[PDB]
Amino acid sequence: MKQYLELMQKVLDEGTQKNDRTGTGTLSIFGHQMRFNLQDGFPLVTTKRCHLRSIIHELLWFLQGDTNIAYLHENNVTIWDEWADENGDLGPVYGKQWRAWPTPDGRHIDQITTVLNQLKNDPDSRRIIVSAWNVGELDKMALAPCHAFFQFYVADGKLSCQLYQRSCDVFLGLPFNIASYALLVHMMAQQCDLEVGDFVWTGGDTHLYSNHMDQTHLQLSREPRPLPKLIIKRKPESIFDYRFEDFEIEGYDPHPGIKAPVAI
Amino acid sequence: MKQYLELMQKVLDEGTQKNDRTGTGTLSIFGHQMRFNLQDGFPLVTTKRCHLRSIIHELLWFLQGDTNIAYLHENNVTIWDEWADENGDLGPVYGKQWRAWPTPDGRHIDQITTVLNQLKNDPDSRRIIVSAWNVGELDKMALAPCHAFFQFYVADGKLSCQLYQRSCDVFLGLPFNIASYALLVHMMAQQCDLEVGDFVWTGGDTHLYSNHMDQTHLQLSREPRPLPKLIIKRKPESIFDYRFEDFEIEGYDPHPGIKAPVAI
Numbered sequence: 372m373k374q375y376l377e378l379m380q381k382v383l384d385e386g387t388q389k390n391d392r393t394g395t396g397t398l399s400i401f402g403h404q405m406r407f408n409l410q411d412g413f414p415l416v417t418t419k420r421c422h423l424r425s426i427i428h429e430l431l432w433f434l435q436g437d438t439n440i441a442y443l444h445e446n447n448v449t450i451w452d453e454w455a456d457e458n459g460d461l462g463p464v465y466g467k468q469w470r471a472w473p474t475p476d477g478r479h480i481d482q483i484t485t486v487l488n489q490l491k492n493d494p495d496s497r498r499i500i501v502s503a504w505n506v507g508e509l510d511k512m513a514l515a516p517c518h519a520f521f522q523f524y525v526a527d528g529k530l531s532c533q534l535y536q537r538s539c540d541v542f543l544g545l546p547f548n549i550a551s552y553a554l555l556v557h558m559m560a561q562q563c564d565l566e567v568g569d570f571v572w573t574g575g576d577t578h579l580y581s582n583h584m585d586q587t588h589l590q591l592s593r594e595p596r597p598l599p600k601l602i603i604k605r606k607p608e609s610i611f612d613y614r615f616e617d618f619e620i621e622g623y624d625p626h627p628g629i630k631a632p633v634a635i
Numbered sequence: 636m637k638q639y640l641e642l643m644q645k646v647l648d649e650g651t652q653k654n655d656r657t658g659t660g661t662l663s664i665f666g667h668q669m670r671f672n673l674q675d676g677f678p679l680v681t682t683k684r685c686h687l688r689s690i691i692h693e694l695l696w697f698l699q700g701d702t703n704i705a706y707l708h709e710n711n712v713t714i715w716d717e718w719a720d721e722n723g724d725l726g727p728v729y730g731k732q733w734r735a736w737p738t739p740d741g742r743h744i745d746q747i748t749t750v751l752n753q754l755k756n757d758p759d760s761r762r763i764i765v766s767a768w769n770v771g772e773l774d775k776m777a778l779a780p781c782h783a784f785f786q787f788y789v790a791d792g793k794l795s796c797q798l799y800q801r802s803c804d805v806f807l808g809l810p811f812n813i814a815s816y817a818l819l820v821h822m823m824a825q826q827c828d829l830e831v832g833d834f835v836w837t838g839g840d841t842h843l844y845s846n847h848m849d850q851t852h853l854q855l856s857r858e859p860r861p862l863p864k865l866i867i868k869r870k871p872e873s874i875f876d877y878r879f880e881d882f883e884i885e886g887y888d889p890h891p892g893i894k895a896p897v898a899i
């Protein structure tokens with residue numbers, strides 16, 4: 372995507388060399404923002420093939436409030452493998468915080484249900500937020516959330532969303548993270564009878580790993596292609612009733628996939 | 636400031652009409668980002684007179700963990716009067732969440748001490764974060780947090796900070812928000828023996844109130860003046876031990892103040 376390839380070139384040209392948690396090393400910038408008008412097309416990177424199978428199941432898993440990777444296994448999804456405990460648990464990561472944020476007094480807040488009701492009853496609200504950054508449970512989480520915080524917004528019948536990503540592996544993570552939240556905006560918009568607006572991506576520590584450089588130079592040599600179109604084939608009874616089969620990406624004609632080793 | 640006046644003009648050129656909680660009406664955009672290199676000067680708006688005294692005291696109050704306006708009144712600061720209850724209490728807003736975020740298992744997390752220790756011991760960490768968005772306590776707060784989430788970053792011996800402001804009153808609120816976080820970066824950098832880097836401001840619902848329009852255009856007719864310079868005159872033994880008199884602002888030569896009504 373044009374904005375994505377501009378970010379990748381900016382990190383190369385302007386990033387500072389950092390040592391990181393993994394010992395791999397990165398080039399890093401701090402603070403970036405991109406905007407995708409979702410009526411221009413679904414923002415799925417075209418300069419390498421990105422597989423949505425795993426994205427979609429993961430988002431459906433988040434929405435079910437699930438943090439045990441069994442559901443992912445049942446669908447041959449392995450991306451949470453490293454971090455699950457001997458019983459297949461990750462602790463209270465995204466799904467738990469989205470669906471059952473615990474109050475200090477033993478109650479719970481369903482942030483997804485709250486946002487749905489805010490969009491349907493108070494669409495002008497400036498407080499339509501889902502946060503995974505539960506400070507009091509970070510220690511129990513298998514991994515600290517990268518997509519920390521997102522906010523919805525309604526203007527002129529269009530639903531927009533902004534994601535704050537505290538830490539962004541530009542090569543391996545960001546294509547999938549953009550697609551996940553773009554998919555969620557379409558789902559939310561459908562359940563609230565809204566049109567789709569913008570997906571705004573904001574990054575904190577935005578980096579390229581030092582062993583992703585050959586892959587980065589290859590990708591930057593490729594020209595982007597027109598964006599595909601997301602079709603939702605069925606309107607479920609609620610945001611919690613979608614199925615993998617409900618989604619079709621029409622007209623996705625990407626360049627070949629690019630493999631690179633993940634920093635553990 | 637150049638960046639601030641460009642934001643005002645963008646809301647005016649690109650914003651849409653929204654009703655709002657307060658009944659006033661706004662012109663708003665969703666998603667914005669701007670940067671202030673703090674080595675260029677202290678980013679206190681010059682195209683109207685802004686009163687740094689309230690900004691400083693409010694920040695010292697936050698850092699104490701206080702959420703009652705009595706301290707502010709001891710120092711003739713009235714900016715929180717409209718939302719306090721009969722006893723001066725705001726509920727568990729910024730200061731409480733910064734210093735003592737309550738967990739479900741009875742603990743409290745001092746996020747300011749946490750990020751100070753991360754900056755001293757693990758400055759490459761990608762999760763040097765303070766959040767005020769405590770979902771489980773929003774209903775106890777007089778106002779939901781506007782400057783909701785911020786992240787620190789270190790490169791080339793300089794401390795940077797990014798704020799996610801989910802809701803921004805551009806004319807009345809934003810000048811105070813920018814200066815407050817810039818001051819905090821200087822204080823943190825002092826305590827960590829770092830130089831100052833960038834303050835990155837990111838906005839969610841970024842709006843001009845309908846009854847701020849004549850004031851906004853008056854300000855836009857003015858040329859920014861040179862940024863003032865912040866001098867800190869002591870190194871306290873901790874981030875919690877600063878005093879109002881430790882700060883001096885040099886070379887602040889603003890255009891006249893512009894009065895506007897706050898939306899309650």
Ligand SMILES: Nc1nc(N)c2c(n1)CC[C@@H](CNc1ccc(C(=O)N[C@@H](CCC(=O)O)C(=O)O)cc1)N2Cc1cn([C@H]2C[C@H](O)[C@@H](COP(=O)(O)O)O2)c(=O)[nH]c1=O
Pocket residue numbers: 392421422423425426429450451514515517518538539540541543544545547548629630631633634761762
């Ligand atoms: N959907 C999603 N994506 C994730 N990437 C992701 C998860 N779920 C959940 C967990 C973990 C999964 N880890 C993996 C990601 C990718 C592969 C992998 O090899 N994929 C292939 C094949 C895929 C396919 O076939 O379709 C391929 O893609 O080709 C393996 C494991 N993550 C977190 C995550 C991390 N990071 C960065 C920021 C920092 O570099 C560092 C954090 O470290 P720190 O705490 O110090 O900041 O990980 C992001 O940027 N975004 C993120 O979501």
Ligand SMILES: Nc1nc(N)c2c(n1)CC[C@@H](CNc1ccc(C(=O)N[C@@H](CCC(=O)O)C(=O)O)cc1)N2
Pocket residue numbers: 684685686714778804807808809811892893894895896897898899
């Ligand atoms: N809608 C809304 N709600 C909030 N709670 C909120 C904000 N906006 C924005 C920032 C913060 C509240 N801080 C302030 C900041 C400034 C003033 C103020 O009075 N400024 C004028 C004087 C006006 C006059 O004399 O008529 C000046 O600068 O001279 C009041 C409160 N929080």
Ligand SMILES: O=c1[nH]c(=O)n([C@H]2C[C@H](O)[C@@H](COP(=O)(O)O)O2)cc1CO
Pocket residue numbers: 497498656778779780781782802803804805807808809812
């Ligand atoms: O620091 C601030 N900066 C700021 O701009 N505001 C403004 C944003 C909104 O106009 C208003 C909050 O109202 P609301 O929760 O509906 O967004 O106060 C409020 C605060 C309070 O800290």
Ligand code: NA
Pocket residue numbers: 400401402403404
């Ligand atoms: Na940038």
Ligand code: NA
Pocket residue numbers: 735743744745
């Ligand atoms: Na504590």
Ligand code: NA
Pocket residue numbers: 699875876877
């Ligand atoms: Na003190």
